[PDB]
Design an enzyme around this catalytic site. Structure first.
Site: not given
Ligand code: K36
Ligand code: K36
Lengths: 298, 298
Positions: A38, A140, A142
């Site tokens: 992603h 950041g 991921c």
């Molecule tokens: C990637 O760096 C990031 C890791 C998340 C951000 C904050 N803590 C984490 O574990 N992934 C995302 O931001 C992700 C991107 C999508 C393409 C999967 N979006 C996401 O995490 O949404 C789900 C969520 C639900 C509730 C709270 C925070 C995020």
């Protein structure tokens, strides 16, 4: 103590991958960089991404990989399930001996959290029965990996992609297949009802017997089937009979075949610790493998 | 979660140091290896050593240092309180930017536990107010160090020497001065009654709010002095104004004044937790500092 593996050999593999606006982390082994796919999504292709056609429109020149401020040249890109692979023109000379494994619920590993390709910290966590991990991860983060070590080999088992509504985390093995029924798209998705890791609770009672104070120790015994019921109620996973003799070493060292053991886990789900704490935790602890116990008493 | 600093920079400085029958770990920085001086003692010497007796009775070739496979030639030796300094003919090319620091009670650091010169695990500790630490350490662990990182700079603060009878641990800064009233003699020593690190507990209540857990908030308010009066009775360190300052950060991002969060913790101490967890636990955690809370929430 909860203990993480020394992180040096994995730190030496961490890089920064940027595509457009999104920066995340990469895993640089030999001449290939692994990262979550992603990275190729904008803020908004993330809600329903057609990764295949997102990726079509990217070329090698759209990927900025950096080891420090040193750019690594991308010379090929491919998608494998939910991870991207970028061939770069330099083999990581820090590449440890390693391999990719897919872990089981209940198995533990160490997370090396990173931000912009730089390691921030390290912690031990377990793969819950509902395929989440109870981690600390911010934006950041991921592309950070979980791993185990065996002698010289790093066994990469997790790469990070997502936080779930309930605050826990979701990810893939290093071939891109998610743990559990999660998809790399930004939608509310099912946590999934969690349970206690029975084998690890018994590992940790054993540790109590080893390292001394077994006050929990009681004088009653059971067999396999009833043991499941009143705790299955406090929500404990099926102890099989092959969790059984991964618990074999600890039974042999203490003298205790699995089940006087069960029958004191009884009483701790039967009238608490009575305000008391075993080894440093006022609650029962379920994130120590049997191997975790042996390693640390060893 | 308890998060240790990444450990690769320390791992590259760890060596094995042997003097006769006795083997432990050393810290290899530039052309000097530092290790606990009781490496010079036999089982019997350690009963009641006169280390300067023992040390004048030795020359360089009685020390064997190894960096993985490779032997390092000891060309000088020297004692600075409870640590030995061994000069070698080669500088460690993996020497980081480092410093030697003496930390205060309540401060944390990560420990890289080593055996035979090889890293085995990493975890966090605090310096208790009684100048012990609640470690996980077995035979062969001496010489392992504790440290914090600060951008590029590893500041070493602890070197390990001893387990007290109560299972906690004792050691020195890297100039070899003990934390606390202990000595590098194998004789039973007591540590003195521990208190609870108050400024850290507040930092963990703030941590808990951030992570959705706010049952403990009240809306009473209290003076700094009123708070220290009650705290005292429960064996809590005084809360300084400095400590109040240090908490200011977390007080902004949550919109809870320090002193009101004191009020809530004061109610926590007069009435217990009646069966409820904070961040999962039935005890109030005092081994996170303010800084460890921010770091892991920013
Ligand atoms: C990637 O760096 C990031 C890791 C998340 C951000 C904050 N803590 C984490 O574990 N992934 C995302 O931001 C992700 C991107 C999508 C393409 C999967 N979006 C996401 O995490 O949404 C789900 C969520 C639900 C509730 C709270 C925070 C995020
Ligand atoms: C250093 O290698 C060793 C580490 C102790 C051993 C067990 N866990 C530790 O942290 N230090 C010592 O053996 C120390 C020697 C100096 C006092 C000269 N004595 C000590 O730590 O207590 C003795 C002990 C031996 C075996 C098990 C528990 C305590």
């Amino acid at each position: 103590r909860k203990m993480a593996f020394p992180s040096g050999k994995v730190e030496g593999c961490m890089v920064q991958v940027t595509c457009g606006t999104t920066t995340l982390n990469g895993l640089w082994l030999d001449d290939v960089v692994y990262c979550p796919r992603h990275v190729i999504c904008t803020s908004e292709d993330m809600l329903n991404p057609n990764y295949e056609d997102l990726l079509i429109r990217k070329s090698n020149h759209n990927f900025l990989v950096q080891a420090g401020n040193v750019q690594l040249r991308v010379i090929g890109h491919s998608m494998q399930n939910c991870v991207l692979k970028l061939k770069v023109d330099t083999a990581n000379p820090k590449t440890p001996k390693y391999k990719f494994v897919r872990i089981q619920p209940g198995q533990t590993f160490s997370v090396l959290a990173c931000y912009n390709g730089s390691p921030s910290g390290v912690y031990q966590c377990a793969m819950r029965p509902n395929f989440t991990i109870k981690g600390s991860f911010l934006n950041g983060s991921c592309g950070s990996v979980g791993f185990n070590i065996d002698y010289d080999c790093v066994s990469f088992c997790y790469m990070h992609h997502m936080e779930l509504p309930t605050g826990v985390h979701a990810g893939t093995d290093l071939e891109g297949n998610f743990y559990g029924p999660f998809v790399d798209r930004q939608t509310a998705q099912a946590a999934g009802t969690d349970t206690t890791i029975t084998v690890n609770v018994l590992a940790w009672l054993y540790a109590a017997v080893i390292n001394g104070d077994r006050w929990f120790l009681n004088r009653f015994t059971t067999t396999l089937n009833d043991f499941n019921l009143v705790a299955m109620k406090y929500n404990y996973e099926p102890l099989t009979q092959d969790h059984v003799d991964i618990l074999g070493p600890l039974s042999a060292q203490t003298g205790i075949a699995v089940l006087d053991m069960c029958a004191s886990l009884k009483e701790l789900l039967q009238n608490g610790m009575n305000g008391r704490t075993i080894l440093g935790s006022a609650l029962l602890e379920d994130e120590f493998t049997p191997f975790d116990v042996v390693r640390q008493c060893s």
